[PDB]
C-alpha cells in the first residue's frame, strides 16, 4: 500500500484576512445628476440580486466587534467628506464683530433668547464698498465679548467652509462588494449573538443595502431583527463597553421644524455666495418630535424582558435619562433634511420595571453651525432651508450604557448613550466578514507521473 | 497599541500653582477627546475636566482650572491653580470612544497609571 | 452548483466541480485600481508556482514524490469520502511550505534527467 | 437620456406676475445653455430670453423679462412681469448645442414639451 | 546688556497685525535677526 501526494489547483478553502472593497450602488438614480457625499457618478454600477447562495454543511465563527469592514468603512466616510468640501467655499470674511438683539415677532413664551437678529457690515463684490446685511443666527452660534457685541462661536479656534447646496446629507444606500478572489461570507442565523458560530452561513458577492446614518443614539433607519429583539455586547459583565439594542418592530417617529424659514443669498466675493436666514414668516414655534406613547412603552416592554436573560429574572430594571456632558451626546443629533438637530430624550428613558392613542412630545434645538465628527478642529455651516422641513424615520435600535452600580442593590440602571460613530455603523455590518479564498491545496492519491 | 503618559505633579503648597500632562501616543490625536478624572480616597471617581471640541469642567473647578490640547504634540494640558487641600487626590488621564466627553467614567476605554498630587 | 457552492460536501465531492472556484478568481478610484492589481497579481503567484513543478494548467497536477505517513496518518480512503476541504486543510496547515519544497526538488531533478535522456540518441 | 421639464405657468391677469421653470435632467447643466422660444398662433417661433455666460433678450422684452439660471438646482427661471394680451403664447423651452445663444430656432437639438401661457 | 560679539544681530521689531475678528487690529512685536530685515525709505 503506497500512495503519493497530489496538488488541487482551484479548490474551495478560505482564511480570515482584510483588503479593500469598493463601490456598489444603484443605478436607477444615476441618471439624476447629484455629485453629492456618497458618489454614484464613480463607481462600478451594482449587479441586479447578487450570486447570494445557500450553503451547506458549514459552520464558521464571526466576530463583529473585532471586524475590520466596520473599521475600513470608517475611514472611508472620514474620506469622503473633506473630499466633498473641498470645492466649497470658506467663512473667513464672515468672521466680523457683530451688532445683535432680541427678536420678538410675538414670539411664543417656549422660546425667549433662541434667535438673534445680528447685523454687521460686510465686503460687496467691489471691495472698495461695503454694505450693512442683517441675518438671524441661533443662541449657540453666538457669544459675548466685553451690551451687544458677539461674534461667530467657532471664530476663534479654527475656520470651516460652508456646505455646498449642490451636495446632499440624505443617506443613500452603499452596497459593499469584494474585489476579485476575495469572497464576503454572511451570517443567517436568527439567535446570533454577535459572537460564535454560525451554523447556517451563505456567501454573497455584494452586501444588501447598507445606509450609513449620522446619529448619536436611537440609530436610525436601520436593518430591523428577524424575531426576539437582541442584546448584542462584548463584555456585559463590564460596563464600560456598550451594548446595541436591536427590536424588529419599529416605532415611528416624526420631527418637524414649524418655523417657516426664507433663504436670503448675500455676496461674499466675485462669485462667492452666502447664504442667510432671512426674516420669519408667520410665530414661531419651536422645533419638536413625536414618538407614540403606546408602541414605545411596549417596545420597552420587549427590552426589558429580554434584558433579564443575561442579569437575572429578580432585578429591578429601571432607566434613566442621558448622562451630561458634551450637546451632542446628551441628546441625539440626527440629520433631517439638511438641517441637524439636538433633541432632548428624557421623556423617553424614564421610568422603571419590577419583576411582578397618546403621543409622548420633546424639545429640540437647532445648531447652524455643528464642530464635525470627522475631525476635532474643523466645523461647519449649514445653510438654511425654506419652508418648514418634517421628516419621519424608523427607529430601529437603542445605544444604552450601563451604569456601573455596587455588586449589592440589584437596582441595575441602564442610560442612553453613544457619540463613537462607530457603532452606529457595527449594527449594519454585524453579519459580513471578509475571507480570502487559498486554491491549490494537497491531498494524498495514488498516480505515477509516467516518464 | 494605544497607551498613556502622565507628567510629575508632586506636592504643593496649599493656593500652590501646578501644570499636569497626557501623552497620546498610539491611536490618532485628532480623532478623540481626552479627559481627567480624579479618585480621592474613600470615593469613586468624578469628572474634573476634559476638551474635545469645547472645553468642559466639573462643578467643583469654579473655573479655577484651564484645558487646552496642543495637536503638535498630541497631549493635554491642565493649568491647575489656587489648589485648595480638598483638592489632593490621584489624577487619572483617559481617552474618551470618540470625539465627545461623557461625564460618567463609562464613557473612555484607555485609562492611565494616575498621578499622584498632594496639597498640604 | 455555484462560486464556494460546495465547501461544506465531501472532499472526494468537492473535485466534481473545481472550475466554478477558479474560473471566477481574476474577474477611491485608486482603491479599485489598487485592487486590480493585487486581484491580477495573486493569480500570476498560484499560476508560477504550479509552473515550477511538472504541470502548467492541467488543474489535476499528481506529483510522483513519495507521501509521508507521519503529517496525515489517515487512511486514504476514510477522508476522501467524509471529511470537507475546509477541515482536512487544518489538519496539515501546520505542515505547510515543506511539501512545496519537495515538489520544486522533485521536479527540477527529473527535468534535467528528461533533457539528457533526449541527448544520448 | 437627455429631457426637459418646465412649470406651471396659466392663465394670468393683464398687467399681472408669472414666473416659468425648465430643468435639464440628462446632461451636464454646466456646459450648455438655456433659451426659452414663443410660438403665437399662427406664426413661427421666436427668441424671447436665453441665458448663457451672459443674458440675452428679444426685440420685444424691453427689459420687462428676468432671466437667470441656478446652476444648484440646474434649472433655468424666467420672470414674467406687465404681461400685455398680445405676449399669449406657448412658451417652449430648448437647450444650445454648446455655451452659446443663437436667435435661430436651428440653433437647439432638445425641446420642450411647451407651456401655454394666457392673458386677459 | 548685549555682549560685544554682536551688536546688531537682533532687531526689535513691532508691527499691525489682524486678531482673529476681521475688524480689530492688534500691535504685537518681535525679534528678528539683522539677515532677515532690509531698509526702506530712521526705522
Ligand atoms: C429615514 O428614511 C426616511 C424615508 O425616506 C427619510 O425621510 C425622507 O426625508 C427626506 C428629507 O429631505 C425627504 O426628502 C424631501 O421630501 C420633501 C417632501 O416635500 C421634498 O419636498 C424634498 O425635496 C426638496 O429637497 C430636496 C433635497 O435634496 C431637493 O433636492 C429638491 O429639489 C426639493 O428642493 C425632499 O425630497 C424624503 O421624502 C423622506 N422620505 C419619505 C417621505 O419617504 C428620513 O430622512 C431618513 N432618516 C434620516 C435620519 O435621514
Ligand atoms: C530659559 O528661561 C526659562 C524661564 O526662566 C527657564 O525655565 C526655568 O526652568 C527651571 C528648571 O527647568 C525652572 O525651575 C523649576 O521651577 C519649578 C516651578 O515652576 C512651576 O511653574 C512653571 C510655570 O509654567 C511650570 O512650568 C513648572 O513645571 C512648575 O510647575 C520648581 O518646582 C522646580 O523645582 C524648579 O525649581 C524655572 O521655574 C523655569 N523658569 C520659569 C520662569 O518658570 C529655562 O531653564 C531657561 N533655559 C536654560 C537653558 O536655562
Ligand atoms: C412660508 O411663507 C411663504 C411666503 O408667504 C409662503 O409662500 C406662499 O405659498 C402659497 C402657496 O404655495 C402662495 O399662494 C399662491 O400664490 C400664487 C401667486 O403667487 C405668484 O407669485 C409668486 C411670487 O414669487 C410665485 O412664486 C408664484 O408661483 C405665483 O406665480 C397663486 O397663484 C396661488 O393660487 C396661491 O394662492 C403664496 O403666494 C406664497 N407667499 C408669497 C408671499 O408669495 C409659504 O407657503 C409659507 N410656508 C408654509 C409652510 O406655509
Ligand atoms: C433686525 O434688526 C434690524 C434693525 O435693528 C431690522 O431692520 C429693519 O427692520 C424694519 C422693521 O423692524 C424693517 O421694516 C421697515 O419698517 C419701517 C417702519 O417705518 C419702514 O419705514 C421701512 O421702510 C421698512 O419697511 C426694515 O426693512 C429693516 N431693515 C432692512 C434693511 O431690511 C430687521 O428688520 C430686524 N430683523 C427682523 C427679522 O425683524
Ligand atoms: C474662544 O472663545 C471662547 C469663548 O470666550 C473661549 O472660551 C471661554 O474662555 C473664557 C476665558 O478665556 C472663559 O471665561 C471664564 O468663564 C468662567 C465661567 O465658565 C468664569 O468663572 C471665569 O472667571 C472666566 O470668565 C469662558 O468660560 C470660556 N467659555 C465660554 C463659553 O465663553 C475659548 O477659550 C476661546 N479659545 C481659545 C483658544 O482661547
Ligand atoms: C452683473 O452686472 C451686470 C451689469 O450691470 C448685470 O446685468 C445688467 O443688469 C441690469 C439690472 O440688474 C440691467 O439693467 C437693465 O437694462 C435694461 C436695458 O437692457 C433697462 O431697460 C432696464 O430698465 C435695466 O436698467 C442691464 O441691462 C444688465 N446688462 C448690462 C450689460 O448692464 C447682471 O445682472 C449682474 N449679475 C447679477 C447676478 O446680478
Ligand atoms: C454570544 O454567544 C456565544 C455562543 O453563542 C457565547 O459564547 C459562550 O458564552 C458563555 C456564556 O454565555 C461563555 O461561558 C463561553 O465561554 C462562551 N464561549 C465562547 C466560545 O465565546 C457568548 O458568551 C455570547 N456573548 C454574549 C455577550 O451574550
Ligand atoms: C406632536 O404632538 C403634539 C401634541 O403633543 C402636537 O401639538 C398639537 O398639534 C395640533 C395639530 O393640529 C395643534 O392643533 C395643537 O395646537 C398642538 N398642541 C397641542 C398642545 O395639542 C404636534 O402638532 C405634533 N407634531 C407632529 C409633527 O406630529
Ligand atoms: C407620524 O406621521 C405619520 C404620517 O404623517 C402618521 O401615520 C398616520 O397616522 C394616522 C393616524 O390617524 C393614520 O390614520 C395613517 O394611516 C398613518 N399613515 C401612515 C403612512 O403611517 C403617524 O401616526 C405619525 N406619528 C404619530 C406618533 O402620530
Ligand atoms: C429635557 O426635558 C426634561 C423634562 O422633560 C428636563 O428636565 C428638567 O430638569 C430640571 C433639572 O432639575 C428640572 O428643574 C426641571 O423641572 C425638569 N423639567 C420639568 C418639565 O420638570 C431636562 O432638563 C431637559 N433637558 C435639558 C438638557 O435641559
Ligand atoms: C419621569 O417619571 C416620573 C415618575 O417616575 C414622573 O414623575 C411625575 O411627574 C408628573 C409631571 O410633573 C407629576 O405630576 C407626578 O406627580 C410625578 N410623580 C410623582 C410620584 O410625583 C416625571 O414627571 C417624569 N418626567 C417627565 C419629564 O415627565
Ligand atoms: C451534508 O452532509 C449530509 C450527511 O453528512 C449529506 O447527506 C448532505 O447531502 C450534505 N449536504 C449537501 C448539500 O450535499
Ligand atoms: C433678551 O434676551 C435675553 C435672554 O436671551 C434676556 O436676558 C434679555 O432680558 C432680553 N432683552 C434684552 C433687551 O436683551
Ligand atoms: C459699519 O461701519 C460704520 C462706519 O463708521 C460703523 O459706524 C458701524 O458701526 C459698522 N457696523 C457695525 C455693525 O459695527
Ligand atoms: C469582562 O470584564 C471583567 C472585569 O474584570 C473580566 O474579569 C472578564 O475577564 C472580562 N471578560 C471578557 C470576555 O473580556
Ligand atoms: C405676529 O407675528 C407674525 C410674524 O410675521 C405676524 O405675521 C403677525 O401679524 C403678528 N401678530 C400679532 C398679533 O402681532
Ligand atoms: C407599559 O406596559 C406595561 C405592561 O404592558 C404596564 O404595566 C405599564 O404600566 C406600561 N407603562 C406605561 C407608561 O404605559
Ligand atoms: C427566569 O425566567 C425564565 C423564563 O421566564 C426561566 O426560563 C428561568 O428558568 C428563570 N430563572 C430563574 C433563576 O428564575
Ligand atoms: C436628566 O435628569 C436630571 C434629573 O435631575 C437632570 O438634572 C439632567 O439635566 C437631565 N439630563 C438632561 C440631558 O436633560
Ligand atoms: C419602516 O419600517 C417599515 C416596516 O419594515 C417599512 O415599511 C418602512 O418603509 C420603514 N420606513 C422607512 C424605510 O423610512
Ligand atoms: C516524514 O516526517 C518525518 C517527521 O515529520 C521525517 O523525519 C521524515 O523524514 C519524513 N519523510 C518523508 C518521506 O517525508
Ligand atoms: C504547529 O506545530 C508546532 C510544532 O510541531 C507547534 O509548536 C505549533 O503550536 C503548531 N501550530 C498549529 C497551529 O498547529
Ligand atoms: C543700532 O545698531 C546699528 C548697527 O546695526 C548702529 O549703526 C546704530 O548706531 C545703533 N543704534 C541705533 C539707534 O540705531
Ligand atoms: C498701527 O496703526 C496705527 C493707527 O494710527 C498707527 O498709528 C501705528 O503707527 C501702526 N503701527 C505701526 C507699527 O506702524
Known amino acids: 500500500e503506497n500512495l503519493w501526494v497530489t496538488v488541487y489547483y482551484g479548490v474551495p478553502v478560505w482564511k480570515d484576512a482584510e483588503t479593500t472593497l469598493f463601490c456598489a450602488s444603484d443605478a436607477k438614480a444615476y441618471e439624476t445628476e447629484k455629485h453629492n457625499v456618497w458618489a454614484t457618478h464613480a463607481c462600478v454600477p451594482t449587479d441586479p440580486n447578487p450570486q447570494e447562495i445557500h450553503l451547506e454543511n458549514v459552520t464558521e465563527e464571526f466576530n463583529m466587534w473585532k471586524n475590520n469592514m466596520v473599521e475600513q468603512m470608517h475611514t472611508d466616510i472620514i474620506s469622503l467628506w473633506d473630499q466633498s468640501l473641498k470645492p466649497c467655499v470658506k467663512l473667513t470674511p464672515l468672521c466680523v464683530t457683530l451688532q445683535c438683539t432680541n427678536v420678538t415677532n410675538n414670539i411664543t413664551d417656549d422660546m425667549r433668547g433662541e434667535l438673534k437678529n445680528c447685523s454687521f457690515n460686510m465686503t460687496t463684490e467691489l471691495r472698495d464698498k461695503k454694505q450693512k446685511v442683517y441675518s438671524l443666527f441661533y443662541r449657540l452660534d453666538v457669544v459675548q465679548i466685553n451690551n451687544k457685541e458677539y461674534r461667530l462661536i467657532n471664530c476663534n479656534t479654527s475656520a470651516c467652509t460652508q456646505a455646498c447646496p449642490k451636495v446632499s446629507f440624505e443617506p443613500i444606500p452603499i452596497h459593499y462588494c469584494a474585489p476579485a478572489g476575495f469572497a464576503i461570507l454572511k451570517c443567517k442565523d436568527k439567535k446570533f449573538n454577535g459572537t460564535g458560530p454560525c451554523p447556517s452561513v451563505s456567501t454573497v458577492q455584494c452586501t444588501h443595502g447598507i445606509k450609513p446614518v449620522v446619529s448619536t443614539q436611537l440609530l436610525l433607519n436601520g436593518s430591523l431583527a428577524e424575531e426576539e429583539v437582541m442584546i448584542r455586547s462584548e463584555n456585559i459583565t463590564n460596563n464600560a463597553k456598550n451594548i446595541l439594542v436591536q427590536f424588529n418592530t419599529p416605532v415611528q417617529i416624526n420631527c418637524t421644524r414649524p418655523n417657516n424659514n426664507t433663504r436670503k443669498s448675500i455676496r461674499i466675493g466675485p462669485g462667492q455666495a452666502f447664504y442667510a436666514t432671512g426674516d420669519i414668516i408667520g410665530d414661531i414655534r419651536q422645533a419638536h418630535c413625536n414618538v407614540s406613547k403606546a408602541t414605545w412603552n411596549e417596545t420597552l416592554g420587549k427590552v426589558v424582558k429580554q434584558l433579564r436573560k443575561h442579569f437575572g429574572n429578580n432585578t429591578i430594571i429601571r432607566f434613566a435619562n442621558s448622562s451630561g456632558g458634551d450637546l451632542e451626546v446628551t441628546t441625539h443629533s440626527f440629520n433631517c433634511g439638511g438641517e441637524f438637530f439636538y433633541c432632548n430624550t428624557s421623556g423617553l428613558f424614564n421610568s422603571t420595571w419590577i419583576s411582578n392613542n397618546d403621543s409622548i412630545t420633546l424639545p429640540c434645538r437647532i445648531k447652524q453651525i455643528i464642530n464635525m465628527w470627522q475631525r476635532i478642529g474643523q466645523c461647519m455651516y449649514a445653510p438654511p432651508i425654506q419652508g418648514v422641513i418634517r421628516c419621519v424615520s424608523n427607529i430601529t435600535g437603542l445605544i444604552l450604557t450601563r451604569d456601573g452600580g455596587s455588586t449589592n442593590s440589584t437596582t441595575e440602571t441602564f442610560r442612553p448613550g453613544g457619540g463613537d460613530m462607530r457603532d452606529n455603523w457595527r449594527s449594519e455590518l454585524y453579519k459580513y466578514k471578509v475571507v480570502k479564498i487559498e486554491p491549490l491545496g494537497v491531498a494524498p492519491t495514488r498516480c505515477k507521473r509516467r516518464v | 497599541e494605544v497607551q498613556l503618559v502622565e507628567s510629575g505633579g508632586g506636592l504643593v503648597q496649599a493656593g500652590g500653582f501646578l501644570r499636569l500632562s497626557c501623552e497620546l501616543r498610539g491611536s490618532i490625536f485628532n480623532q478623540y477627546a481626552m479627559a481627567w478624572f480624579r479618585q480621592a480616597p474613600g470615593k469613586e471617581r468624578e469628572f474634573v475636566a476634559g476638551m474635545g471640541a469645547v472645553p468642559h469642567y466639573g462643578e467643583f473647578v469654579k473655573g479655577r482650572f484651564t484645558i487646552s490640547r496642543d495637536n503638535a504634540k498630541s497631549t493635554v494640558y491642565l493649568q491647575m491653580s489656587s489648589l485648595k487641600p480638598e483638592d489632593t487626590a490621584i489624577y487619572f488621564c483617559?481617552?474618551?470612544?470618540?470625539?465627545?466627553?461623557?461625564?460618567?467614567?463609562?464613557?473612555?476605554?484607555?485609562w492611565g497609571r494616575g498621578t499622584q498630587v498632594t496639597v498640604s | 452548483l455555484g462560486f464556494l457552492g460546495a465547501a461544506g460536501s465531501t472532499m472526494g465531492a468537492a473535485s466534481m466541480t473545481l472550475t466554478v472556484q477558479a474560473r471566477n478568481l481574476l474577474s477611491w478610484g485608486i482603491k479599485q485600481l489598487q485592487a486590480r492589481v493585487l486581484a491580477v497579481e495573486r493569480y500570476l503567484r498560484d499560476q508560477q508556482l504550479l509552473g515550477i513543478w511538472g504541470c502548467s494548467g492541467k488543474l489535476i497536477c499528481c506529483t510522483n514524490v513519495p507521501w509521508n505517513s507521519s503529517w496525515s496518518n489517515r487512511n486514504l480512503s476514510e477522508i476522501w469520502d467524509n471529511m470537507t476541504w475546509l477541515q482536512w486543510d487544518k489538519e496539515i496547515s501546520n505542515y505547510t511550505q515543506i511539501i512545496y519544497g519537495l515538489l520544486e526538488e522533485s521536479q527540477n531533478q527529473q527535468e534535467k534527467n528528461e533533457q539528457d535522456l533526449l541527448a544520448l540518441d | 437620456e437627455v429631457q426637459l421639464v418646465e412649470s406651471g405657468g396659466g392663465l394670468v391677469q393683464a398687467g399681472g406676475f408669472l414666473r416659468l421653470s425648465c430643468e435639464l435632467r440628462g446632461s451636464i447643466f454646466n456646459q450648455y445653455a438655456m433659451a426659452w422660444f414663443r410660438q403665437a398662433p399662427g406664426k413661427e417661433r421666436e427668441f424671447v430670453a436665453g441665458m448663457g455666460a451672459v443674458p440675452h433678450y428679444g426685440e420685444f422684452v424691453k427689459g420687462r423679462f428676468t432671466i437667470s439660471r441656478d446652476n444648484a438646482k440646474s434649472t433655468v427661471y424666467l420672470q414674467m412681469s406687465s404681461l400685455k394680451p398680445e405676449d399669449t403664447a406657448i412658451?417652449?423651452?430648448?437647450?444650445?448645442?454648446?455655451?452659446?445663444?443663437?436667435?435661430?430656432?436651428?440653433?437647439?437639438?432638445?425641446?420642450?414639451?411647451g407651456t401655454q401661457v394666457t392673458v386677459s | 546688556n548685549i555682549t560685544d560679539d554682536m551688536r546688531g544681530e537682533l532687531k526689535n521689531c513691532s508691527f499691525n497685525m489682524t486678531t482673529e475678528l476681521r475688524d480689530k487690529k492688534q500691535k504685537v512685536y518681535s525679534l528678528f535677526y539683522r539677515l532677515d530685515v532690509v531698509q526702506i525709505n530712521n526705522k
Open positions: 483617559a481617552r474618551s470612544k470618540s470625539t465627545y466627553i461623557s461625564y460618567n467614567s463609562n464613557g473612555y476605554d484607555y
